[PDB]
Every structure is written in structure tokens, then in C-alpha cells.
RNA sequence: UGGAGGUGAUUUAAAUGC
RNA sequence: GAGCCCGGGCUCCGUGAGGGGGGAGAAGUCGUAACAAGGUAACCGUAGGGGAACCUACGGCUCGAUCACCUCCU
RNA sequence: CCCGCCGCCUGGGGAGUACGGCCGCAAGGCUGAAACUUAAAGGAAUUGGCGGGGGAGCACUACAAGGGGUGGAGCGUGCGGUUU
């Protein structure tokens, strides 16, 4: 039985853009938006994201247009699952 | 005038890999200026290799773009 | 280290200097 | 002779000395002049009011994140743009942008921002002439405008 | 028993890690 | 005999494109500089050169190196 | 341990820098902050681990010496992966 974590409240698919520095990334979002994200430490100390990879984001309570949390990063498989579940879409990934 | 030029990735050391410059005219352009002026622009190590610039990582955009930046053709640039 | 600091210092001031004597 | 001229009509030295020596404490220097006084906005004051340009959220030092409450708020008189560190949970609520926001500093005038909070220097206690620990108790007094 | 010089010096052992 | 005015000089307050550095953030890159003789001892003042850490020359110093070789001293 | 005088210091980093002045042919020197930021900077000794630090000594999961073999094939097996 396959089970995905899914975005809740106001978090947002992403697609990781650009790698920044220092656990900085902007991330290209569902809604149109490019938001400069922080990868917390907890994050950090477990998985590898890069350039590409879909994550979830939590925009900012304050310019939530402009700024997020990622708070999870999917795997390929996942992405295959949401893809095929219509969570997202092939020209969203590819950008 | 007429100068092409290829910018690749190429394996190097630490890191992942390199980047590759070729196609210069040497009798023309002074590589050893170029790469300097390169290397500054992308903050890494880097030398003239036979007629050639190695750039340690992968900047063929940054590279690319400051090319056109100096003069040379956007037309006569290509990354791989 | 002093070395660094002493040369990134002159190379400071003369460059800067340099901007001042222009 | 451990420093000091002793004989009976040197003394001016020592006068002299003492206060030479004096200005290698920065705080008593920097009063003397008015340092304290000149630079860290309030002209000196215990407090001061001012308009709330807009609310900004910022993130927490080193061990640390979190998302501190800060208002930016500019001093009327003074004129001058201040980031500042809001007390409370829920707080960035109760403040409505451009009501008045009275602010003060916040453990020791030095400078020191406390030890999570980069900038901030300051605090805030009031939201239109009623304070903050005034409206987290939901029965004391609530906000208007 | 513990201290100061003077000169051979050894390249056969490789950069990094939150 | 004031204020007032006029022309010039000098200085100071409110404020401005642009520009310098600091204490930082520590997930990108380059390298291995120092800390073990750090793998060419290290530092030092001076001078030149190098993208960078830095290298080299000349003089100094040990806060200097590990045996070995030679020399002294309770 | 006392008596006399003199220079210098007053946490770190900013910075031995800015500005100003003085001196210097030039290179530079002498004099010398503040904004800001930090709960350390530091010193000696102790222990341990470590060094392509030095001496002594062992080992057979060590290396030499030596005999055999794995890595080539087919098959058995457990795994990585993929598939389901």
C-alpha cells in the first residue's frame, strides 16, 4: 500500500529551482510563484535535495508570497504517484 | 570576424565537475588573461590547459554569459 | 596569517588610495 | 617605584594620569561625551511612540529558529526607522498597521538585541494607548480602530 | 642524571567530510 | 545706535544615486594554508609575484622541527 | 623585599583601519577612532586520542616468505536493484 505525504493548509507542490547556499533554495511553486525557502535543520540532517526534486513548501506567515519553509522532499517514485493521482502535472515538473 | 567557441562540462577533482572552454584563437586572444578574468567570476580554481580553459565545477552559464559580457559573439557560443 | 593581513591591508589602502589620488 | 611619582608637589601628574587613563573605559568615555545619548535613536528617552509602517516577521540566531514577532515602527519626532521585537504569543494580531506603537528598549541599552534576537534593541508595549501583556488577558482591556 | 648549540637530514605515506 | 538688507567666503543641521567595511547565516565552489616536521618547520620586518588560501628572496627569531652526527653542563 | 622616576595597558573583533595633522623622493612611517557585533579572546599545565613524531616488543583478522584459492564458467545460496 503506497502512501504519499500530501501538502495541508496552505503549503504548495514545488519544484526546487535554484540551490542558494547555506540551506537557502528558491523553489518554484504551484501557484505561479517563485519563493525563497529555508530547509530547516531537522530537514537538512536527513534527505539530499537538489535542483529539480518537487518538495513541499509552507509559505511564511509574512510574504507568504515571496518566502517559504520546505518542510518535505519527495521521492521519485512519490512524484510518479502524484503525477498519476493528478497531485501535479508532467509541465509543471519540467517547468 | 568569426570565433567559435564549446563549453562543457569536464571531470575534474572535488566537488563534480569541472568546465571546459575551447575554441579561442590564441594567436588572438590571451588565454592566461581570459582565465584569470574567469576564474573571478566564478570564484574557483582553474588553469590553461594545452589551448584550452579548465574551470573547477560547473559554470558554463555564468561562463557563457560572461563571454558576451567581454565582446565575443553571443552567436559564436555554445554550451553542451 | 600577518603576512595575509599586512599585504590585504596595503593592497587596501593602495587600491584605495588609489582611488583617492583619483 | 611601582608607577606613580610620590613626592609632595607631583600630584598634578597623578591628576593628569588618572583621567588620561580614565578613557579606556568605552562606557565612561562614552557618557562623558554622550555617545549613549547621540546614537541609538530616542534622543536618550525612557520610551517613544510611533506609526506603524508595516509588521515583519524575521528568523531566529545560530542554535535557533523560530519566527519572532517585530514591528517596524517609525519615531515621530525623531524620525527614524526602527525594527523592533514584540512581546507575547499570539501579539502581531492585536497590532493593527498605523495605529500608535510606543516602544522601549530591552536588557541593558548597550546594544544588545537579547540573546535569540539578532537586531532588535527595543519593545513594544502599547497598541493604541493600551499594551500588549494588557491584551494577551482577553478580559482587561480589547483593541479598537 | 637532567640542559644548549653547529647540519645531515627522510620522501617510500594522497584533498575532504555536515 | 538694533533690526533689517545685499554680494562674496567659511561651517553646521534635514535629506540622496552610488559606494566601504564589520559581527553573521552556515547545504553551493575552489584549494589545503595553519594546528602533528600538517607531509616544503613555523613565525617575523621588508620587497615582488599569484585567483585564493599563499609562494618566493633577504635578513632575524624560536614561541624550532625528529632521530642521527659532533661539541659543552650539575 | 624596599625606595625614586619614566613609558605603556585596561575583554574580543571591527582595526592598527577611516578621517585629520605631522614626516617621508617614493615606497611608506608616526599619531589614531566610531558606528556594529560577541560570551568569549587568551595563558599554563593534565589526561586522553592523534602525527607521513622517535625508541622498545609482539601478532598470524597483520605483511613478507610460502601453499592454496576468490575475481573468468555453470550451478547453490543471501543480498542490492527491479518486477509484482
Same mark, same amino acid.
Given at each position: 500500500?503506497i ?10 507542490f !514545488? ?6 547556499? &547555506?540551506g537557502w533554495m ?10 525563497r525557502?529555508?530547509?530547516?535543520? +531537522?530537514?537538512?540532517?536527513? @534527505?539530499?535535495?537538489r ?8 509559505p ?6 515571496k518566502?517559504?519553509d520546505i518542510?518535505? *522532499? ?10 498519476? %493521482?493528478?497531485?501535479?502535472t ?6 | 570576424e568569426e570565433?567559435?567557441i564549446?563549453?562543457? @562540462? ?7 565537475? $569541472?568546465?571546459?572552454?575551447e ?15 574567469l ?13 584550452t ?6 559554470? *558554463?552559464?555564468?561562463? &557563457?554569459?560572461?563571454?558576451?559580457? $567581454? ?9 553542451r | $596569517? ?13 587600491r584605495? *588610495?588609489? +582611488?583617492?589620488?583619483? | !617605584?611601582?608607577? &606613580?611619582?610620590?613626592?609632595?608637589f ?5 591628576? #593628569? ?5 580614565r ?11 554622550? #555617545?549613549?545619548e547621540?546614537?541609538? =535613536? #530616542?534622543? !536618550?528617552?525612557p520610551?517613544a511612540?510611533?506609526?506603524? #509602517?508595516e %509588521?515583519?516577521?524575521?528568523? &531566529? ?6 519566527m519572532?514577532?517585530?514591528?517596524? @515602527? ?18 502581531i ?13 530591552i536588557?541593558? =541599552?548597550?546594544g544588545?538585541?537579547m540573546?535569540?534576537?539578532?537586531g ?8 493604541n494607548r493600551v499594551?500588549? +501583556? ?7 482591556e480589547?483593541?479598537?480602530?
Amino acid at each position: 500500500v503506497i502512501r504519499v505525504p500530501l501538502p495541508e493548509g496552505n503549503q504548495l507542490f !514545488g519544484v526546487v529551482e535554484q540551490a542558494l547556499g &547555506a540551506g537557502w533554495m528558491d523553489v518554484r511553486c504551484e501557484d505561479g510563484k517563485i519563493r525563497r525557502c529555508r530547509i530547516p535543520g +531537522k530537514l537538512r540532517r536527513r @534527505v539530499w535535495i537538489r535542483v529539480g526534486d518537487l518538495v513541499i513548501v509552507q509559505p511564511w506567515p509574512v510574504q507568504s508570497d515571496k518566502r517559504g519553509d520546505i518542510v518535505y *522532499r519527495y521521492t521519485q517514485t512519490q512524484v510518479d504517484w502524484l503525477l498519476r %493521482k493528478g497531485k501535479i502535472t508532467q509541465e509543471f515538473l519540467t517547468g | 570576424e568569426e570565433q567559435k567557441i564549446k563549453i562543457y @562540462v569536464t571531470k575534474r577533482r572535488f566537488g563534480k565537475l $569541472m568546465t571546459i572552454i575551447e575554441g579561442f584563437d590564441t594567436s588572438v586572444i590571451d588565454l592566461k588573461e581570459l582565465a584569470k578574468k574567469l576564474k573571478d567570476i566564478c570564484a574557483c580554481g582553474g588553469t590553461v590547459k594545452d589551448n584550452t580553459i579548465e574551470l573547477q565545477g560547473d559554470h *558554463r552559464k555564468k561562463v &557563457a554569459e560572461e563571454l558576451v559580457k $567581454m565582446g565575443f559573439s553571443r552567436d559564436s557560443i555554445e554550451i553542451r | $596569517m600577518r603576512w595575509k593581513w599586512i599585504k590585504k591591508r596595503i593592497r587596501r589602502l593602495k587600491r584605495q *588610495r588609489k +582611488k583617492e589620488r583619483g | !617605584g611601582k608607577k &606613580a611619582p610620590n613626592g609632595e608637589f607631583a600630584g598634578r601628574k597623578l591628576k #593628569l594620569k588618572r583621567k588620561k587613563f580614565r578613557w579606556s573605559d568605552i562606557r565612561y568615555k562614552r557618557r562623558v561625551l554622550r #555617545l549613549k545619548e547621540k546614537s541609538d =535613536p #530616542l534622543e !536618550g528617552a525612557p520610551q517613544a511612540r510611533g506609526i506603524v #509602517l508595516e %509588521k515583519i516577521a524575521v528568523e &531566529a540566531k545560530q542554535p535557533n529558529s523560530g519566527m519572532r514577532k517585530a514591528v517596524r @515602527v517609525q519615531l515621530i519626532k525623531n524620525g527614524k526607522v526602527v525594527t523592533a521585537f514584540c512581546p507575547g504569543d499570539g501579539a502581531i494580531k492585536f497590532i493593527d498597521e498605523h495605529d500608535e506603537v510606543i516602544i522601549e528598549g530591552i536588557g541593558g =541599552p548597550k546594544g544588545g538585541s537579547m540573546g535569540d534576537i539578532p537586531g532588535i534593541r527595543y519593545k513594544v508595549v502599547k497598541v493604541n494607548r493600551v499594551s500588549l +501583556k494588557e491584551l494577551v488577558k482577553g478580559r482587561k482591556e480589547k483593541p479598537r480602530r
